[PDB]
Design a protein around this ligand. Structure first.
Ligand SMILES: CN(C)c1ccc(O)c(C(=O)c2ccc(C(=O)N[C@@H]3CCCNC[C@H]3NC(=O)c3ccncc3)cc2)c1
Lengths: 20, 337
């Protein structure tokens, strides 16, 4: 599932912004 | 009357925008209790104002770290805009000041915790629950965009829930006052509009793209575009092939196809009717826009709150003691702060 793919990803914690 | 409220809130903003509040407190008026959150240059901490016993949230930023990352101007933007805005769903700045090593912003303490925490724990919000939140953001962006501000970092992480279940936007670090266009590549990868990614020059419409991401994430429990590495996230955003979960109602899917729209001539919030295309959409039909503004809608989720100074809706973080050097650091760069 899409949900399971998300939970297994490295991106379920707080996300930091990128910048210049 | 919508038009009359915005012209008044505009006069109030420009007065403060042209003549910002400076040095209205000092470090030793606050007891530092606990870290609520971090970023590149420091942390936001629960503090107690000793003269009143009031709790606040104090952002501490290490000026040398700001300079080492070339973010002087974005931090000045952050403080100048924050001290000047006033709207029910923007976190309210009480004081700001600086010393030899640091910058300080004392804000309202918002005890309900980040939306991000609740969203992840519960998994996802039902459509009514997400709409409730969405509507607040639609009005907040209506207010900000009227002042010529772009926010540029919308996400569950920056959306704090207060005692009555309502939103307070935090973290104006990428906020900027812009008539015309701007070009900085900044934001959270999941939330970035395609035009930011393609180095095209953009305006306030990148916030409305971001609103589509947020709504989608609130309702599905995951964002429309994700993957382990930022570069892969950007590939999927520029393709703009959104898959919706089967549980998304046909109105939601239709809102989202119009917000997550690559073509600025068709993206909602950016058209002739502007923001009204979003408010007059079917997914928002049961939404009472004036009752949201006035905080008189029952919230779908009221945070557990066991007394002042309680921090149970936040994660734990490593503490670090503040050091104040005996020499002024970067004084001319932060002189307007
Ligand atoms: C350009 N970059 C790197 C940048 C720009 C502007 C900045 O202020 C910073 C910072 O270093 C920074 C330092 C600290 C924070 C911070 O701790 N923010 C927290 C946690 C991160 C997620 N956003 C929510 C935010 N929390 C709050 O602001 C908060 C306020 C009131 N009550 C509870 C919480 C955020 C940013 C960094």
């Amino acid at each position: 599932t899409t949900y399971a793919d998300f939970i297994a990803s490295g991106r379920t914690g707080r996300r930091n912004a990128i910048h210049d | 009357s919508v038009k009359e409220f915005l012209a008044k809130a505009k006069e109030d903003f420009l007065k403060k925008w042209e003549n910002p509040a400076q040095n209205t407190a000092h470090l030793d008026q606050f007891e530092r209790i606990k870290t609520l959150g971090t970023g590149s240059f420091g942390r936001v901490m629960l503090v107690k104002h000793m003269e009143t016993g009031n709790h606040y949230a104090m952002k501490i930023l290490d000026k040398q770290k700001v300079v080492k990352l070339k973010q002087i101007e974005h931090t000045l933007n952050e403080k100048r805009i924050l001290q000047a805005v006033n709207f029910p769903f923007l976190v309210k700045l009480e004081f700001s000041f600086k010393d030899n090593s640091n910058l300080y912003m004392v804000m309202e303490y918002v005890p309900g915790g980040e939306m991000f925490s609740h969203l992840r724990r519960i998994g996802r919000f039902s459509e009514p629950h997400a709409r409730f939140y969405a509507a607040q953001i639609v009005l907040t962006f209506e207010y900000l965009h009227s002042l010529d501000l772009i926010y540029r970092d919308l996400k569950p992480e920056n959306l704090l829930i207060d005692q009555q279940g309502y939103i307070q936007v935090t973290d104006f670090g990428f906020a900027k006052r812009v008539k015309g266009r701007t070009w900085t590549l900044c934001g959270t990868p999941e939330y970035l509009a395609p035009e930011i990614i393609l180095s095209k020059g953009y305006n306030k419409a990148v916030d409305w793209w971001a609103l589509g991401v947020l709504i989608y994430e609130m309702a599905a429990g995951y964002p429309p575009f994700f993957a382990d590495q930022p570069i892969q996230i950007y590939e999927k955003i520029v393709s703009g092939k959104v898959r919706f979960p089967s549980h998304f109602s046909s109105d939601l899917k239709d809102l989202l196809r119009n917000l997550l729209q690559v073509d600025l001539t068709k993206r909602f919030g950016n058209l002739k009717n502007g923001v009204n295309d979003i408010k007059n959409h079917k997914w928002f039909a049961t939404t009472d826009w004036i009752a949201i503004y006035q905080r008189k809608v029952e919230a779908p989720f009221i945070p557990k709150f066991k007394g002042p100074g309680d921090t149970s809706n936040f994660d734990d973080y490593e503490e670090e003691e503040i050091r104040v050097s005996i020499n002024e650091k970067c004084g001319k760069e932060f002189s307007e702060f």
